[PDB]
Amino acid sequence: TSHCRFYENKYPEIDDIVMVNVQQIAEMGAYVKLLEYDNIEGMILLSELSRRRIRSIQKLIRVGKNDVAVVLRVDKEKGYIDLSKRRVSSEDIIKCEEKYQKSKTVHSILRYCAELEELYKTIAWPLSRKFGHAYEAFKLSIIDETVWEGIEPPSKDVLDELKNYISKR
Amino acid sequence: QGEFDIVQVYKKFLQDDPEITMPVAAIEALVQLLSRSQAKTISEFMDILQNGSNTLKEGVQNNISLSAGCDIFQRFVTRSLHDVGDFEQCKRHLVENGKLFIQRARACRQRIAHLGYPLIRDGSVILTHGFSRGVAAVLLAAAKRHVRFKVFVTESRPSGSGCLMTRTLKNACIPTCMVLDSAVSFTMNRVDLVLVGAEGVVENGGLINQIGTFQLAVFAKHAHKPFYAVAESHKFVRMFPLSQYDIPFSRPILEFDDPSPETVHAIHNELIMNEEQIRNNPTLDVTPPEFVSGLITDLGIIDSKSGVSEELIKLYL
Amino acid sequence: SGSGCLMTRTLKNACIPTCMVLDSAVSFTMNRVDLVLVGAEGVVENGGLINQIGTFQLAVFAKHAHKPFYAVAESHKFVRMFPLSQYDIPFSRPILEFDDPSPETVAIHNELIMNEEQIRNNPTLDVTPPEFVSGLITDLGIIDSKSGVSEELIKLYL
Amino acid sequence: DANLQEKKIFEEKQVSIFSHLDWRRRRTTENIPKDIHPAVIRLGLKLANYKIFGSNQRCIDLLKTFKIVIQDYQTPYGTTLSRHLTTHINSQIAYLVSTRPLSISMGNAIRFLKLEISVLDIDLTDDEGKELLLEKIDSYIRDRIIIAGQVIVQAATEKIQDGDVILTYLHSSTVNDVLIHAKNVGKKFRVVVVDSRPEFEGRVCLKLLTEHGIECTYVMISALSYIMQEVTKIFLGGHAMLSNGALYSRAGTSLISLLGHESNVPVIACCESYKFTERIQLDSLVYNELAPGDQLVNMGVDDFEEKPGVLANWKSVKNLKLLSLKYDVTPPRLITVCVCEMGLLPSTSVPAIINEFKQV
């Protein structure tokens, strides 16, 4: 257990919006990988990819950075995921990236203490199942103790250490 | 079962119809591979035909026109493709537009003839190289319009397709006269036009065809007689040969011996390079655009050799 | 003539690498070659070069490839004739005639060639004009002016 | 002034085939006007005293400077931003022109910047109009120059083959970034570096490539006939590509191309799209740009040093006048390919790409 996903969902439903870093471009689409789900595969059609103003576009500027896309279809039994960016709501774009880094923030915490997949069962996902999201109340965890209502880690052997790491605010 | 090795379907259409070329076959095969398939995601669809094309592409010895035709076929489908509401529209828009490509594809060789035959003039003298269904159609369409003309034919080593193209014309009651490869120059003064097929059209408006093509083009240039080449649109390839030599080599080409001291101690038609050393010889030459008076396609006749690219760029979406 | 299959042997018996190239593939060969050298079956008043059927075929490529073209000829081959074009030579047999048909329907394919009847219709010889020959190798020396071929030729026939 | 000057600048249409080429240069700040932002002046000096000023870096530094101008611009609030801003900019190029004629990489950039001025909506406030333009410029720099370079570098590197020996001439920072990027991907090759008088712009390409560990050879242009026998490909970065397909680059760029064609080696032209132009020249003398003739006086292998040439009085000697053009026009039939960010195009396909952008 060295790398685990971000949310309870092994796969995201349709109409979900997810941050994703591009891997390569091909004659038929843009092979990508979704960060919030352990970088599983995914393909973005050229037409559904952002519009262009070149004869045959070759500005692979996006080929390395992380972009935001919506989900179109999912086949959980083979791994195929069809996505698109052109349809992504220009304002709802940032709401992903806004709600991204906090998830990235939380994952940064565990990975430090996780050197994992079970810990999300223990605290993360149920808390995000408790409140709206693990971040909207994680600052309260250092100001309150009723947060752990129904919390069962493996032990407080490292949770107590983690409590001391909620300090970084 | 499901979809067997589509090379069979590919190979079947060649036997179900020999009067259709290799490119139009695979396109007729993929549409089937698209039709007899249920993918449920756009990814699986294009993940198939890529493996579908490459398999076909890896099947034949990486034939240009085929590897050309398939790559064009994909980008036509995935161009105006979009997923809206339901999903069957995807497979619908694919095979429907995919079927349309073929319809537009097989009819290309007809458009060419309807545009080519006015090049043939009463009493003119034509020169072609090797066999090429494109040259056939226009030349036949000339005779069927009742015009008088004579044509030469190149022996077309190593393919030897000159003998075949010689026949295919004679059976249409038009004169013939086979010229062996080493004597095209001697005849150019006697000709008024030079027609030839095309196995591949490249970005600089070049002309990839059989080994003897560029041989003719320079002679036509030096003899101030025009040079016309027939090419189907789906042969436009996205490659740019610098010099008239940099082309991919399936084999290694033109190597020498290493003869250490071992002494091993006017028509002679039997004296011929063996099948081993012929394989050492190349099979394709590339004619630069400067030597092409005009490129005749289903898109029309193209003289620019700069609009060849624009038309090509219009193809790969 | 097929004499290519023989010349390659004559070299190999002296430890010389050989690569037989099709008659239809000299163009592809040029950018590799540094110099082309041929024999001569007859030399002409205009400095021409009557030799086998393929000489002018690759004499132009050498021009187009800017590689020098050299030809070897012995003095006892200077002939007193003058062609106006690369075709003005006497034909033993009438060459390059067309069949006259009538409504009668009737990779590598090395075994597919012209019959011994079609070949005899094709020409035997070929003449390269002097602008395509960088120089001429004779016992009289190396000649290149293509007006000095005439002085020497005139020096002979008298 | 310009009323009388325009007659003067026309009276220079006479026997000397260079009589029309404007020679006037402002190399100092003497009698400089006041409408001139500092960062423009610092550029005006660099435009007139630098000598290794790539056609790209000028258009970059020009626009970056223009940003500061527009930022520090204070629109008369008796009007709006749109009106009376190009007029402010127009009075900046007139200085910047007088220090060295506008390149082609600059004019088109200027010709573009003036458009986005004329189109923005008046609803925006000045602090909104500025922040808009600053974006359009920064985009113009990345989309049309930098990224376009990064594409060309890759596409050009593709046609490089192990065992090549390629030839550059007179430091084109584009074609350097290719060779540089060519060694890093492990392509096995070597370089020939053709230089020429007066300002040996080559020996800085030799410096760069050597400092990257590239086999290189150095010969002056008069050694072309001797060295072309080794070369296999020729790479040229141009100042601009004309609409006839011609390559508008520096001096010997033609002889490089010509000699190569007469040795069956290819002339690959690397030039970004925005350097294209609707202009079209039949000779390398209609449109061109002059350099000081005194730079020819220096004999030996150094620019500014102690070489009292035997011509140092040419300005005062009758019937003896030195000159040195610095760009020349090479016909298409020698250039075999233009590698632009739109891909490898035949040089003659330029005006299409121009008309491509003109749909707006």
Do B163 and C113 touch, CB atoms closer than 8 A? yes
Cα–Cα dist B302/B205, whole Å: 9
- D134 plus D208 within the same structural domain: no
Do C17 and B259 touch, CB atoms closer than 8 A? yes
Pairing of strands A81-84, B124-128: unpaired
Q: How many angstroms away from the CA of A60 is the closest CA of chain D?
A: 8
Per DSSP, A142 falls in state T
**Where exactly does CATH 1.20.120.1070 map onto chain B?**
6-113
Do D263 and D230 touch, CB atoms closer than 8 A? no
Amino acid at D133: L
Give the architecture (CATH level 2) of B6-113: Up-down Bundle (1.20)
Q: How many angstroms away from the CA of C74 is the closest CA of chain D?
A: 32
- D146 plus D191 within the same structural domain: no
Cα–Cα dist D44/D96, whole Å: 6
Structure tokens at D35: 């409408």
- Give the chain C residue nearest D229 (alpha carbons): C34
Q: Does B48 touch chain A (CB under 8 A)?
A: no
- D253 plus D320 within the same structural domain: yes
* Residue the block writes with tokens 């611009």: D73
Task: State the CATH number of the domain containing residue A22.
Answer: 2.40.50.140
Structure tokens at D129: 């109009």
Chain D hits for A56, CB-CB cut-off 8 Å, are 342-343
Pick from B170, B181, B174, B128: which is nearest to C113 by CA?
A: B181
- D120 plus D167 within the same structural domain: no
Which residue, of D151, D181, D200, is where some domain finishes? D151
| Cα B129–Cα C113–Cα C125 angle in degrees, nearest 5 | 75
User: Quick one: how far is CA B250 from the chain centroid?
Assistant: 17
Cα–Cα dist B99/B106, whole Å: 11
* Residue the block writes with tokens 């699986």: B44
CB-CB under 8 Å, B190 with C96:
yes
Cα–Cα dist D219/D214, whole Å: 16
According to CATH, the topology of domain B114-315 is Rossmann fold (3.40.50)
Number of structural domains found in chain A: 2
Which residue, of A72, A88, A104, is where some domain finishes? A88
CB-CB under 8 Å, B80 with A56:
no
The neighbour count for residue B62, using CB atoms within 10 Å, is 11
Pick from D204, A46, D196, A7: which is nearest to B317 by CA?
A: A46
Cα–Cα dist C113/B176, whole Å: 15
- D220 plus D343 within the same structural domain: yes
Contact D/A (≥3 CB pairs under 8 Å): yes
- What CA–CA distances, in Å, run from B294 to A21, B196, B231, D152? 47, 11, 11, 30
Q: Which of C28, C57, C103 sits opposite B173 (nearest CB)?
A: C103
- D98 plus D77 within the same structural domain: yes
Cα–Cα dist A124/B171, whole Å: 82
Structure tokens at B219: 């002679």
Structure tokens at A127: 């808390």
Name residues 229-288 of chain B within 8 A of D (Cβ): 240, 242-243, 246
**Is omega for the bond preceding D198 within 30 degrees of 0, making it cis?**
yes
Chain D hits for C66, CB-CB cut-off 8 Å, are 262-264
Alpha carbon distance, N-terminus to C-terminus of chain C: 35
3-state class percentages of chain A: helix first, strand second, coil last, to nearest 5: 30, 20, 50
Cα–Cα dist A18/A83, whole Å: 10
- A77 plus A113 within the same structural domain: no
Pick from B290, B292, B317: which is nearest to B302 by CA?
A: B292
Instruction: Indicate the burial class of B243 (C-beta count within 10 angstroms; 0-12, 13-18, 19 or more).
Output: middle
- State the DSSP H helix or E strand holding residue C143, giving kind and residue range, or none if neither: strand C141-143
Structure tokens at C9: 């042997």
Sign of CA dihedral B145, B104, B300, B231: negative
Do B286 and B206 touch, CB atoms closer than 8 A? yes
Task: State the CATH number of the domain containing residue A140.
Answer: 1.10.150.190
Cα–Cα dist A82/A99, whole Å: 22
Structural domain of D288: 152-360
Task: Give partners of C (≥3 CB pairs < 8 A).
Answer: B, D
Pick from C23, C41, C120, C131: which is nearest to C79 by CA?
A: C41
* Residue the block writes with tokens 């048909």: C101
Which residue, of D151, D167, D191, is where some domain finishes? D151
According to CATH, the topology of domain C1-156 is Rossmann fold (3.40.50)
Instruction: Indicate the burial class of D328 (C-beta count within 10 angstroms; 0-12, 13-18, 19 or more).
Output: buried
Cα–Cα dist D293/C58, whole Å: 49
Q: How many angstroms away from the CA of C107 is the closest CA of chain D?
A: 28
**Where exactly does CATH 3.40.50.10470 map onto chain B?**
114-315
- D141 plus D243 within the same structural domain: no
What is the Cβ-side half-sphere exposure of residue C157, based on CA atoms within 13 angstroms? 12
Cα–Cα dist B125/B188, whole Å: 10
- The angle, 0 to 180 degrees and rounded to 10, between the axes of the packed helices B22-35 and B88-106 is 160
Contact A/B (≥3 CB pairs under 8 Å): yes
Do C30 and C67 touch, CB atoms closer than 8 A? yes
Do B210 and B181 touch, CB atoms closer than 8 A? no
- State the DSSP H helix or E strand holding residue B166, giving kind and residue range, or none if neither: helix B161-170
Amino acid at D242: L
**Interface list for chain D against chain A, based on CB atoms closer than 8 Å:** 142-143, 147, 151, 155, 341-343, 353, 356
The neighbour count for residue D225, using CB atoms within 10 Å, is 11
**Obtained via which technique?**
X-ray
Alpha carbon distance, N-terminus to C-terminus of chain D: 39
Q: How many angstroms away from the CA of D201 is the closest CA of chain A?
A: 31
- What CA–CA distances, in Å, run from B138 to B117, B142, B287? 5, 6, 21
CB-CB under 8 Å, D143 with A58:
no
Do B115 and B296 touch, CB atoms closer than 8 A? yes
Do D258 and D334 touch, CB atoms closer than 8 A? yes
Which residue, of A88, A118, A148, is where some domain finishes? A88
Cα–Cα dist C96/C114, whole Å: 13
Structure tokens at C73: 């000829």
Which residue, of A73, A88, A103, is where some domain finishes? A88
- D103 plus D161 within the same structural domain: no
Q: Does D263 touch chain C (CB under 8 A)?
A: yes
Number of structural domains found in chain D: 2
Do C149 and C42 touch, CB atoms closer than 8 A? no
Cα–Cα dist D73/D314, whole Å: 46
For residue C49, give the 3-state DSSP assignment.
Answer: strand
Output the 3-class SS for chain D. Answer: CHHHHHHHHHHCCCCCCCCCCCCCCCCCCCCCCCCCCHHHHHHHHHHHHCCCCCHHHHHHHHHHHHHHHHHHCCCCCCCCCCCCCHHHHHHHHHHHHHHCCCCHHHHHHHHHHHHHHHHCCCCCCHHHHHHHHHHHHHHHHHHHHHHHHHHHHHHHHHCCCCCEEEEEECCCHHHHHHHHHHHHCCCCEEEEEEECCCCCCHHHHHHHHHCCCCCEEEEEHHHHHHHCCCCCEEEEECCEECCCCCEEECCCHHHHHHHHHCCCCCEEEECCHHHCCCCCCCCCCCCCCECCHHHHCCCCCCCCCCCCCCCCCCCCCCCCCCCCECCEEECHHHCCEEEECCEEECHHHHHHHHHHHCCC
Q: Torsions phi, psi of B205, nearest 5?
A: 70, 15
Structural domain of A10: 1-88
Structure tokens at A25: 């471009």
Per DSSP, C75 falls in state G
- A113 plus A82 within the same structural domain: no
CA Rg value for chain D: 22
- D177 plus D134 within the same structural domain: no
Q: Which of B242, B290, B310 sits opposite D159 (nearest CB)?
A: B242
Cα–Cα dist A42/B33, whole Å: 23
Edge-first strand listing for the sheet containing D247-249: D240-241, D247-249, D328-330
- D147 plus D35 within the same structural domain: yes
